[PDB]
Amino acid sequence: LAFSPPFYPSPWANGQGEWAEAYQRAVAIVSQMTLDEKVNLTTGTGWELEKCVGQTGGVPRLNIGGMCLQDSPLGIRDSDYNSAFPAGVNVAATWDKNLAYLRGQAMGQEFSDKGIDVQLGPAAGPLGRSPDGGRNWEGFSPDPALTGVLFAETIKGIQDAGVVATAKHYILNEQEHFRQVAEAAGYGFNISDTISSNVDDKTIHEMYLWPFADAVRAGVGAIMCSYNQINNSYGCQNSYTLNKLLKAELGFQGFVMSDWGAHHSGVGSALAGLDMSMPGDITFDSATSFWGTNLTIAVLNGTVPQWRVDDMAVRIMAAYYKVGRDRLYQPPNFSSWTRDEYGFKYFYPQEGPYEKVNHFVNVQRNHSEVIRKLGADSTVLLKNNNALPLTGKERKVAILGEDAGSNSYGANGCSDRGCDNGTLAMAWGSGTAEFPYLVTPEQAIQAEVLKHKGSVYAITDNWALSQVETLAKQASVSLVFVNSDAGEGYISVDGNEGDRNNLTLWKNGDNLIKAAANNCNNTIVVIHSVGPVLVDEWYDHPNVTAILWAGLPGQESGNSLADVLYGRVNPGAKSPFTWGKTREAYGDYLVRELNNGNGAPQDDFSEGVFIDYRGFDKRNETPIYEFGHGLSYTTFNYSGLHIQVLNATETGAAPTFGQVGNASDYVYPEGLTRISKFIYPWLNSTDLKASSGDPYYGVDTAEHVPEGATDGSPQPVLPAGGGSGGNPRLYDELIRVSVTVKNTGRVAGDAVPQLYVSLGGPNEPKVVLRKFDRLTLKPSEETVWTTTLTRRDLSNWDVAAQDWVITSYPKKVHVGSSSRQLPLHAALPKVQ
Amino acid sequence: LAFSPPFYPSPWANGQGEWAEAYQRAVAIVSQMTLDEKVNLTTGTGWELEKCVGQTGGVPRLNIGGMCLQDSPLGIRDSDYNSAFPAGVNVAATWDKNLAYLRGQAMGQEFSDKGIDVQLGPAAGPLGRSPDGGRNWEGFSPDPALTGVLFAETIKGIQDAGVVATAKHYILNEQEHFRQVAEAAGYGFNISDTISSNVDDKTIHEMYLWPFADAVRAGVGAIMCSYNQINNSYGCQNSYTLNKLLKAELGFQGFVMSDWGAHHSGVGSALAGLDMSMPGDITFDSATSFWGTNLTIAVLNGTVPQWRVDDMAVRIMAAYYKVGRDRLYQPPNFSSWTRDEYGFKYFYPQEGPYEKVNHFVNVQRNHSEVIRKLGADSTVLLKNNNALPLTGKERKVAILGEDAGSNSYGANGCSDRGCDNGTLAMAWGSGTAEFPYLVTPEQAIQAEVLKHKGSVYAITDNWALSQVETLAKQASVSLVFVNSDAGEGYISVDGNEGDRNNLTLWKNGDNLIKAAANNCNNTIVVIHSVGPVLVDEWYDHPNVTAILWAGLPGQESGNSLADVLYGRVNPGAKSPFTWGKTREAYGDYLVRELNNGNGAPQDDFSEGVFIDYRGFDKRNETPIYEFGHGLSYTTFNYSGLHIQVLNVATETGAAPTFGQVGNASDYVYPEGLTRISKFIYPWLNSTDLKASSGDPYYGVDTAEHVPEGATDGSPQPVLPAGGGSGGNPRLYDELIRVSVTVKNTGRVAGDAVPQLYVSLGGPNEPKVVLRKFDRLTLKPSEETVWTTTLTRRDLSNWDVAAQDWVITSYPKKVHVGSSSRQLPLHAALPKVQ
Ligand SMILES: *[C@@H]1O[C@H](CO)[C@@H](O[C@@H]2O[C@H](CO)[C@@H](O[C@@H]3O[C@H](CO[C@H]4O[C@H](CO[C@H]5O[C@H](CO)[C@@H](O)[C@H](O)[C@@H]5O[C@H]5O[C@H](CO)[C@@H](O)[C@H](O)[C@@H]5O)[C@@H](O)[C@H](O[C@H]5O[C@H](CO)[C@@H](O)[C@H](O)[C@@H]5O[C@H]5O[C@H](CO)[C@@H](O)[C@H](O)[C@@H]5O)[C@@H]4O)[C@@H](O)[C@H](O[C@H]4O[C@H](CO)[C@@H](O)[C@H](O)[C@@H]4O[C@H]4O[C@H](CO)[C@@H](O)[C@H](O)[C@@H]4O)[C@@H]3O)[C@H](O)[C@H]2NC(C)=O)[C@H](O)[C@H]1NC(C)=O
Ligand SMILES: *[C@@H]1O[C@H](CO)[C@@H](O[C@@H]2O[C@H](CO)[C@@H](O[C@@H]3O[C@H](CO[C@H]4O[C@H](CO)[C@@H](O)[C@H](O)[C@@H]4O)[C@@H](O)[C@H](O[C@H]4O[C@H](CO)[C@@H](O)[C@H](O)[C@@H]4O[C@H]4O[C@H](CO)[C@@H](O)[C@H](O)[C@@H]4O[C@H]4O[C@H](CO)[C@@H](O)[C@H](O)[C@@H]4O)[C@@H]3O)[C@H](O)[C@H]2NC(C)=O)[C@H](O)[C@H]1NC(C)=O
Ligand SMILES: *[C@@H]1O[C@H](CO)[C@@H](O[C@@H]2O[C@H](CO)[C@@H](O[C@@H]3O[C@H](CO[C@H]4O[C@H](CO)[C@@H](O)[C@H](O)[C@@H]4O)[C@@H](O)[C@H](O[C@H]4O[C@H](CO)[C@@H](O)[C@H](O)[C@@H]4O[C@H]4O[C@H](CO)[C@@H](O)[C@H](O)[C@@H]4O[C@H]4O[C@H](CO)[C@@H](O)[C@H](O)[C@@H]4O)[C@@H]3O)[C@H](O)[C@H]2NC(C)=O)[C@H](O)[C@H]1NC(C)=O
Ligand SMILES: *[C@@H]1O[C@H](CO)[C@@H](O[C@@H]2O[C@H](CO)[C@@H](O[C@@H]3O[C@H](CO[C@H]4O[C@H](CO[C@H]5O[C@H](CO)[C@@H](O)[C@H](O)[C@@H]5O[C@H]5O[C@H](CO)[C@@H](O)[C@H](O)[C@@H]5O)[C@@H](O)[C@H](O)[C@@H]4O)[C@@H](O)[C@H](O[C@H]4O[C@H](CO)[C@@H](O)[C@H](O)[C@@H]4O)[C@@H]3O)[C@H](O)[C@H]2NC(C)=O)[C@H](O)[C@H]1NC(C)=O
Ligand SMILES: *[C@@H]1O[C@H](CO)[C@@H](O)[C@H](O)[C@H]1NC(C)=O
Numbered sequence A: 001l002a003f004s005p006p007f008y009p010s011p012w013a014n015g016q017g018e019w020a021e022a023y024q025r026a027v028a029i030v031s032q033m034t035l036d037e038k039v040n041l042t043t044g045t046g047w048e049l050e051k052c053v054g055q056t057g058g059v060p061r062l063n064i065g066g067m068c069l070q071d072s073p074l075g076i077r078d079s080d081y082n083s084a085f086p087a088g089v090n091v092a093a094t095w096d097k098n099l100a101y102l103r104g105q106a107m108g109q110e111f112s113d114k115g116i117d118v119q120l121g122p123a124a125g126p127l128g129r130s131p132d133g134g135r136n137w138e139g140f141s142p143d144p145a146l147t148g149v150l151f152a153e154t155i156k157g158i159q160d161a162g163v164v165a166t167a168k169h170y171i172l173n174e175q176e177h178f179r180q181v182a183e184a185a186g187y188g189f190n191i192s193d194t195i196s197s198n199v200d201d202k203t204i205h206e207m208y209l210w211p212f213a214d215a216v217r218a219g220v221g222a223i224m225c226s227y228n229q230i231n232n233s234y235g236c237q238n239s240y241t242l243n244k245l246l247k248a249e250l251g252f253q254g255f256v257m258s259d260w261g262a263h264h265s266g267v268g269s270a271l272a273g274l275d276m277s278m279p280g281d282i283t284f285d286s287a288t289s290f291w292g293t294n295l296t297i298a299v300l301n302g303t304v305p306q307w308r309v310d311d312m313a314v315r316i317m318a319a320y321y322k323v324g325r326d327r328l329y330q331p332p333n334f335s336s337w338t339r340d341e342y343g344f345k346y347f348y349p350q351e352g353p354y355e356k357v358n359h360f361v362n363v364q365r366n367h368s369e370v371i372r373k374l375g376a377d378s379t380v381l382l383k384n385n386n387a388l389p390l391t392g393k394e395r396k397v398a399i400l401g402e403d404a405g406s407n408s409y410g411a412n413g414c415s416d417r418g419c420d421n422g423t424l425a426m427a428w429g430s431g432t433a434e435f436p437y438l439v440t441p442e443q444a445i446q447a448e449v450l451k452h453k454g455s456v457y458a459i460t461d462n463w464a465l466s467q468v469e470t471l472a473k474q475a476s477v478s479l480v481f482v483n484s485d486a487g488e489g490y491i492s493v494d495g496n497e498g499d500r501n502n503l504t505l506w507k508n509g510d511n512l513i514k515a516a517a518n519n520c521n522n523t524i525v526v527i528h529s530v531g532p533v534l535v536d537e538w539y540d541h542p543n544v545t546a547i548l549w550a551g552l553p554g555q556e557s558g559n560s561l562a563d564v565l566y567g568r569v570n571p572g573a574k575s576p577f578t579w580g581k582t583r584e585a586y587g588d589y590l591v592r593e594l595n596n597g598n599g600a601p602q603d604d605f606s607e608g609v610f611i612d613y614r615g616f617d618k619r620n621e622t623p624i625y626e627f628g629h630g631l632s633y634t635t636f637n638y639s640g641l642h643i644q645v646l647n648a649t650e651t652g653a654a655p656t657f658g659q660v661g662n663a664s665d666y667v668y669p670e671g672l673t674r675i676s677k678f679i680y681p682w683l684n685s686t687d688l689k690a691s692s693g694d695p696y697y698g699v700d701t702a703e704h705v706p707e708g709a710t711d712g713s714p715q716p717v718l719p720a721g722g723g724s725g726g727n728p729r730l731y732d733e734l735i736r737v738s739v740t741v742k743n744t745g746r747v748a749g750d751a752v753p754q755l756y757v758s759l760g761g762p763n764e765p766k767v768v769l770r771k772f773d774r775l776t777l778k779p780s781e782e783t784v785w786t787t788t789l790t791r792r793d794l795s796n797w798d799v800a801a802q803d804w805v806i807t808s809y810p811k812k813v814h815v816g817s818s819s820r821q822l823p824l825h826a827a828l829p830k831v832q
Numbered sequence B: 001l002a003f004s005p006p007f008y009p010s011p012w013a014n015g016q017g018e019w020a021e022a023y024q025r026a027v028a029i030v031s032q033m034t035l036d037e038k039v040n041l042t043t044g045t046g047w048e049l050e051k052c053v054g055q056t057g058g059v060p061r062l063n064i065g066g067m068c069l070q071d072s073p074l075g076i077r078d079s080d081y082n083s084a085f086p087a088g089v090n091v092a093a094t095w096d097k098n099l100a101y102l103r104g105q106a107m108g109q110e111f112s113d114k115g116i117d118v119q120l121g122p123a124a125g126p127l128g129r130s131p132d133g134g135r136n137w138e139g140f141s142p143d144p145a146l147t148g149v150l151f152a153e154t155i156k157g158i159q160d161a162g163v164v165a166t167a168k169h170y171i172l173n174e175q176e177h178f179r180q181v182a183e184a185a186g187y188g189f190n191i192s193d194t195i196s197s198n199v200d201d202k203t204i205h206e207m208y209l210w211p212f213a214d215a216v217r218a219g220v221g222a223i224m225c226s227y228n229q230i231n232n233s234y235g236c237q238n239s240y241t242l243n244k245l246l247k248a249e250l251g252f253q254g255f256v257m258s259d260w261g262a263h264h265s266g267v268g269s270a271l272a273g274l275d276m277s278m279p280g281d282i283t284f285d286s287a288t289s290f291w292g293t294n295l296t297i298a299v300l301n302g303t304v305p306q307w308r309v310d311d312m313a314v315r316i317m318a319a320y321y322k323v324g325r326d327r328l329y330q331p332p333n334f335s336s337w338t339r340d341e342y343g344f345k346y347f348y349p350q351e352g353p354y355e356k357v358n359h360f361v362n363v364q365r366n367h368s369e370v371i372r373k374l375g376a377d378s379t380v381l382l383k384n385n386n387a388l389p390l391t392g393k394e395r396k397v398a399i400l401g402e403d404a405g406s407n408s409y410g411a412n413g414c415s416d417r418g419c420d421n422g423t424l425a426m427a428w429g430s431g432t433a434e435f436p437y438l439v440t441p442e443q444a445i446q447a448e449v450l451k452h453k454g455s456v457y458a459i460t461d462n463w464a465l466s467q468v469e470t471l472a473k474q475a476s477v478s479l480v481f482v483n484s485d486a487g488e489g490y491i492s493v494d495g496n497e498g499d500r501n502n503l504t505l506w507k508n509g510d511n512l513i514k515a516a517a518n519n520c521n522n523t524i525v526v527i528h529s530v531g532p533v534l535v536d537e538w539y540d541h542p543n544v545t546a547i548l549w550a551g552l553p554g555q556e557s558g559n560s561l562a563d564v565l566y567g568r569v570n571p572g573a574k575s576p577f578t579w580g581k582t583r584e585a586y587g588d589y590l591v592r593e594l595n596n597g598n599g600a601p602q603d604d605f606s607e608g609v610f611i612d613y614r615g616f617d618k619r620n621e622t623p624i625y626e627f628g629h630g631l632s633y634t635t636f637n638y639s640g641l642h643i644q645v646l647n648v649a650t651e652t653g654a655a656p657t658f659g660q661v662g663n664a665s666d667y668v669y670p671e672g673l674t675r676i677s678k679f680i681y682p683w684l685n686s687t688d689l690k691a692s693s694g695d696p697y698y699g700v701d702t703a704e705h706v707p708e709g710a711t712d713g714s715p716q717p718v719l720p721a722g723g724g725s726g727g728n729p730r731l732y733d734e735l736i737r738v739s740v741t742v743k744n745t746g747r748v749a750g751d752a753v754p755q756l757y758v759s760l761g762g763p764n765e766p767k768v769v770l771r772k773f774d775r776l777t778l779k780p781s782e783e784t785v786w787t788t789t790l791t792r793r794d795l796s797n798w799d800v801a802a803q804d805w806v807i808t809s810y811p812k813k814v815h816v817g818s819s820s821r822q823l824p825l826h827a828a829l830p831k832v833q
Helices: A017-030 A035-042 A088-094 A097-113 A144-160 A181-186 A201-208 A210-217 A239-249 A267-272 A293-300 A306-322 A368-377 A441-451 A465-474 A509-517 A554-565 A613-618 A688-692 B017-030 B035-042 B088-094 B097-113 B144-160 B181-186 B201-208 B210-217 B239-249 B267-271 B293-300 B306-322 B367-377 B441-451 B465-474 B509-517 B554-565 B613-619 B689-693
Strands: A068-070 A164-170 A196-198 A222-225 A255-258 A342-346 A351-356 A380-384 A396-400 A455-459 A477-484 A523-529 A544-549 A602-604 A636-645 A733-743 A749-751 A754-758 A768-772 A775-777 A782-790 A796-798 A803-805 A812-816 A824-827 B068-070 B164-170 B196-198 B222-225 B255-258 B342-346 B351-356 B380-384 B396-400 B455-459 B477-484 B523-529 B544-549 B602-604 B636-645 B734-744 B750-752 B755-759 B769-773 B776-778 B783-791 B797-799 B804-806 B813-817 B825-828
Touching: A017 A306, A035 A293, A035 A306, A088 A097, A088 A144, A088 A368, A097 A144, A097 A368, A144 A164, A144 A201, A144 A210, A144 A768, A164 A210, A164 A239, A164 A306, A201 A210, A201 A796, A222 A239, A239 A267, A255 A306, A267 A293, A267 A306, A293 A306, A293 A688, A368 A554, A396 A441, A396 A465, A396 A509, A441 A455, A441 A477, A441 A554, A441 B441, A455 A465, A465 A509, A477 A509, A509 A523, A523 A554, A636 A812, A636 A824, A733 A749, A733 A775, A733 A812, A768 A782, A775 A782, B017 B306, B035 B293, B035 B306, B088 B097, B088 B144, B088 B367, B097 B144, B097 B367, B144 B164, B144 B201, B144 B210, B144 B769, B164 B210, B164 B239, B164 B306, B201 B210, B201 B797, B222 B239, B255 B306, B267 B293, B267 B306, B293 B306, B293 B689, B367 B554, B396 B441, B396 B465, B396 B509, B441 B455, B441 B477, B441 B554, B455 B465, B465 B509, B477 B509, B509 B523, B523 B554, B636 B813, B636 B825, B734 B750, B734 B776, B734 B813, B769 B783, B776 B783
Parallel strands: A164 A222, A196 A602, A222 A255, A396 A455, A396 A477, A477 A523, A523 A544, B164 B222, B196 B602, B222 B255, B396 B455, B396 B477, B477 B523, B523 B544
Antiparallel strands: A342 A351, A380 A544, A636 A733, A733 A782, A749 A775, A754 A768, A754 A812, A796 A803, A812 A824, B342 B351, B380 B544, B636 B734, B734 B783, B750 B776, B755 B769, B755 B813, B797 B804, B813 B825
16 A cells, blocks of 8 residues: 655744744744643634634734634635635636736735635645546646646735635645545445545656645745545645645745644644644534644643644744734624524524624625636637627527526525536535626626627527527527536535536537537537536537637626627637547546545556646647637737746754643633533643543554654755745746747737747656746737746656756757647757 | 397498598509409418418509518517517506507507518407406406507507507407317317307497497507307307497498408308408318308309498408508518528418518617616506615615526527516417517616626526525515416416416415515515416515516516616506405406307306406405506695586498409419419309309308398498497597696606596496596606596496487596595586586
């Protein structure tokens, strides 16, 4: 079985780079705290005990309010009068750093105005190993450069708005099946521990870890560790991924929190680099915690050093001060668990004072404008045989497909969006928000048609093919809507347990398109989906005259689409994944059956870096629509490639901050009423064993604490660490590349130039993306696009050196409009 | 068994009143015709043989194109790029003569621009005897005065736009059950003939005939006779209703056409007053006709007098010239039977040249604006506890009910509207049109809320009550949409065979309303329906803060409603029928079982004139919402009622003939002519009349089957009640002027609908009967004097001994006010005669 080697001790924060100020303030405040106050910072108060999906108790003596952590990466979850933004995969399709940032900002503002201190997003894990993974749509793209940049911009947007962002899920949570034992049991499978992602050291560095290096470097304040194991050690106590890769090598200064039920031990996780337990209890409402009381006892009894808990408290406070949260603090002014105005203060046990729990604060501002724009700028025009834009003069318009229409249960009518009914604007699970409303394609396109005095209808039953065919025969243009949905693994829709069972259009989508195209010579297909779908059966039908993929557009869906179809917005989006002819063309099969008896299923990432386009390229398979493909209402020319060559070894000892007293200091205080199921930091009595209630208390302790796990002395700095997101020399700029881009067509719009490198060597992909931008040019206008390649951009990870090295194989650079349209290339000069 | 006495001969046209000129042109052109040409005008060419749902062959030698007849009373049926107008019941609810006129003009324009000569509408039969009748919605109101006035304005709108209107269905077709023998068989009922409406002479004069008098007097060119029998004589050969009441008493100068399959004999129908056979064959595509060949033969063999067929020709051409159709003539430029651009000329057999059958002409103009306004102006505000209008500042708006949402098969996705899916904007059957689009309440309300930056959702599955209750608990206002549908009898939706099986909301509507009102203190109910529904279980819920009935609004439905809800239009509409506590409170049960063995079911109108509010008032039963009731966003005051007393041939000419009839050999099929399969022609196979007729009863007991007087072309007496248009002209003398002051006493501009009722007195007269109304726009504080006049007809009763209208000696009173139960002003009327 794959094995996860140890790396200890858990590195302590040190004020690195842009953290210096936040760190000194954290140390100043944590130095005033008692042990039970520190522990209150690290442990949630119990599932549904307070307002937010995650909430800690804070430190009231020092005026630090409990920290409220809320989903999702696309808008506030379980709340009211908030916006519902396009999913992260739509951000990836924009290839637009500025939009990623603005969406970040607009979300952080909404969260902040609800009294939420930490947003649980953005996501870059799953990166998107498999096309049918149930949660890729929450993240960005299976390409690490594209994902890393937009993930970092999203983070900066959210944090500049005063809310701590949480880069999740760390790491290798690439499929929903078998991610949690109790879930798998509900789906008929008996496993003793969750699926283990087994991954070699080079692949993890070059693919899955790279966007987390970007997030660290961009200043992200929190990381959420994952439910799956990595080489059979759970994500939230994997000393190699958390202590070595995240903290020692990437130099992460913020705090790591568990996913909800991902916490699996007290001492083991604390020493393997976890900082925050969510939602705080061992299972929901168990009234027990691996930390809380137990972490106070673990320090008192000598097993967890004081420097470890002190460092947890310092990382947590520093992330809070780093985004300025203290200046914006207010208690959460809504409840995740009810929409009632009044309720008991502590929801799950219905205890505490009966008082106002919801204030109905409308935090939307004018964010519907950035949503509508981001939806239009993420609508990829995959095919256009001279059909779009429409003029508004088409005499009779057929709107065809359930995906154009309303959810008959209401837009929020399926809990956590766990159904596929009506237009698909948001996929399912915890990665969701309540729509304030949902503009459907039927609404926006019919309103556009009626504004020009046209005739228009919508057919939204995909088995009503008799009606579809009759109307398609009468129409000037048929706009056909289809979808494919997926989501987090605790919800199953039509037998898809989070992950998609296939890549085919749902609700009869292929038969619908053929019914319409067989009968109307101007049939235009619009796809809303979580990821790629198979288009092979109809994409080259001679009456399918255009095809668009609009992703998961959020609340302004129909308006974002009508803007594109009627030429108000010239589509500039590019596919952020590959569109293959078959499911087999992508390889990388999900693990769907137990392969390790009733032990943890074993998920070997045996393709290495070869996922999405790298895998297609290596197999010489031609995609229908490649990574980076998308059309425009204008054309662009790329010419004139120009290349120019450009000109701590030990840590401190672990500090302690403040003092730890006798057990009687930490016994429940006398006048306090303990709320049922509420998780506290306090002990029932000075008897440590009885107060822990742990059946393993004090047994074989030293044998269960890895070697080095308590060592507070100065540590070596890793060759690849020493900076933020890696050794700073990885970020030196070695080569400048420039090209001329001209708009040669007749419509103003945006080009997305893309720069790929060939690193060389028998095991390297043919091309890997490194740089891109999105540049606005009016007709005939030109501009020089210039960018630089960093030492990291030209390196591979070398397992013998434990460092990035520029290998001696000759390297090339390529510039053009997609991974398969690269008219400009050059050999790169040797650099090191 | 009820018996229908004979009245013969069938009166001939005479150029009465405004028909003088059209009649002179008709005689001049018909005087040039041969017998086979005249026959061609009276007979359709067979089901689906040409373009229009009925079409004659015309008279090509004299450049008279075939007449194209097309449904429906609310917009062009079976066509493209046309508008879908609100139903006739909505026009009733507007109480607005001007809107009725403007809707008739917008429709006539559209029909004319498609090459259609005759619109098959508007409808005042069924009048609305039973609240669950399947086609009341196509007509206006169970009240004869309200109906007759808006029917007449609708006809003047259509005809002033250059298309012949057809007043239908004449007469007493007050239910769909047992209306046609083959339809009844399709439903498991074995009957030998159609249901017989059996009605006394005074009720038919005072109720069902009255709007047809107004139609005739307003100039209607055509009348369509009905499928039912009346006293066991078929509506399209009933000499009493056709010859006596319509032609001799009301003085009708235009032509009578059959309903489709309502023609039941050649000789008998022609003598009893029918003028045109539709669609022309005996049964669809039977290639046989009671007329066509048979009518040419019936004149040749002496059974039907030449003057009778000359008169059919003269009435048909006169209706055509009267509206000026000859000046707008063009072949129908669409096909009812296919939307294809090209097709065989003759659809049913797929024969004739292969040529252009559709030109896709867009005839809609800006008719959406009159549709939008008439939908808003027909939305009756039944209850409003200071809930409406909305301001747009409502923070969260719940739109609840399938009736708010789209039809998942597309607006036209159910053939002839035969389903109740999504919002109900048009009921079912032949009285239908293709929507060019349909704006749903969901669309227009959600767009309104978004313009204000509110939050809004629509739940459109009426059994998703968990989601309904959860959203309603969150909502500032819950707008709940419910409906009840019905239509022509040839379609059955959910076991409703045209007629509605009950008056209860469809699709779980009562439960949906309770789910919302139990959870939301500001629940507003919007009803789309063909007629009244039972509101008793929830209308007085303390959380139901407003209730509206918006009828069947046609293609602008959601915009018409949003205009009212957000106060761009202050509702002025008034209920045109009564909302009772129970079905039993209306009486007037439909006949739903065979009650005459396997012969015609017998439908006795034993309540007489006591239908709708007359019945409630006679029984002292209190409606929840009375006839005439509607609220407004302002209030009106009525004061100062005052009354002021104000200051014909006896024989016809002899029946004329125009032009000549020759030998049988003149009428044999022309040798150079390809005879299209199923097409109906006027020609004879040979000079052998018996053989050419193919009639198994040819020459059988003929004299016995020709009623006494049926061939009598001599001068006839003029009936005491006849001699004018819509009756003896002395019936229209104005005898009393009434005036009252109407004031807007509230804070916003709005329309009042003052209503003038009379009590005619007598032990068996209704307590009150509507006679006058108008719809008057007033700004806040503004006052106006409303003046109208009562005619001699308005004060009379039908006296069956006299066969005339008489003002009886019981003292009469006038009552003016805002509804049939809210009449604060009353005056005794002085004796007048
Ligand atoms: C001061 O106060 C403190 C607070 O109260 C006291 O704290 C308690 O101390 C106890 C010890 O005194 C702790 O109990 C022991 O816990 C260990 C750790 O269990 C967790 O981690 C397991 C993985 O361990 C590796 O990885 C972590 C880091 O991730 C390391 O910390 C470990 O040292 C170990 O490292 C090796 O491996 C990694 C790579 O993976 C390398 O990198 C390293 O170099 C090392 O090689 C993990 O598997 C555990 O998962 C179980 O528990 C989860 C629920 O918690 C459950 O979800 C999982 O499915 C799994 O369930 C199964 O096992 C549990 C029992 O652990 C059963 O109850 C359950 O039925 C299932 O069987 C977990 O997340 C734990 O291993 C110990 O248990 C082993 O040993 C005891 C005997 O001593 C046996 O009785 C047990 O069966 C078990 O035996 C297995 O393991 C042995 C290998 O070690 C092997 O020999 C056996 O054959 C068998 O395979 C103890 O349970 C307790 O956690 C802690 N409490 C709190 C609140 O923190 C403290 O004691 C006190 N101090 C003093 C001085 O008084
Ligand atoms: C870890 O995080 C957790 C979660 O956030 C922290 O747990 C919370 O800690 C709070 C203390 O910081 C504790 O707050 C208490 O709440 C009680 C309930 O308050 C609500 O109800 C009351 C009463 O109806 C309303 O007034 C109030 O506004 C709330 O709606 C309060 O009643 C407690 O008030 C008392 O203490 C505060 C100061 O803490 C005083 O200012 C206040 O006057 C009260 O003082 C009396 O009681 C205290 C001790 O209870 C005595 O010391 C004092 O002398 C007074 O005693 C008189 O009155 C009491 C009865 O009231 C009488 O018995 C006595 O004989 C005297 O006559 C306080 O406000 C939260 O409840 C608690 N949350 C939960 C879920 O448990 C935890 O602290 C964090 N841990 C660390 C280490 O940081
Ligand atoms: C009752 O109503 C019914 C239904 O409306 C009436 O029935 C219709 O009557 C029409 C009038 O007679 C009759 O029309 C005939 O249609 C034929 C076919 O028309 C179409 O297809 C052809 C063939 O592909 C196309 O070419 C044509 O354009 C149409 O698309 C025609 O072939 C007949 O046309 C001729 O006669 C008329 C006079 O009516 C001329 O004006 C016209 O120009 C044609 O003229 C030639 O034919 C006549 C012989 O009648 C000659 O006298 C003349 O000099 C021309 O001669 C040359 O050409 C002919 C024919 O090719 C040739 O044989 C000769 O030697 C010369 O070379 C005519 O148009 C409809 O078919 C019929 N509809 C149905 C469904 O049956 C009915 O009449 C009404 N009854 C009454 C009593 O009013
Ligand atoms: C990949 O992954 C996807 C996602 O998980 C998989 O998709 C599922 O595929 C299943 C297997 O194919 C799908 O299940 C099938 O669904 C069919 C349709 O179900 C729905 O629609 C029907 C038909 O509705 C019409 O008729 C109704 C009245 O009967 C009417 O109300 C409705 O409005 C429609 O009206 C039109 O049609 C009638 C005439 O038919 C006209 O009169 C009318 O005017 C209109 O024109 C409805 O009956 C049904 O209840 C439902 O709403 C079912 O039809 C399938 O049934 C066939 O097989 C049955 C058992 O399997 C058997 O009973 C029966 O005999 C049938 O032959 C079947 O349930 C499922 O929906 C898909 N799910 C999604 C989310 O898309 C996919 O399989 C995977 N692909 C691969 C390759 O693995
Ligand atoms: C008239 O002649 C046609 C053509 O032969 C024949 O088919 C039809 O049946 C005949 N009609 C009658 C009544 O005999």
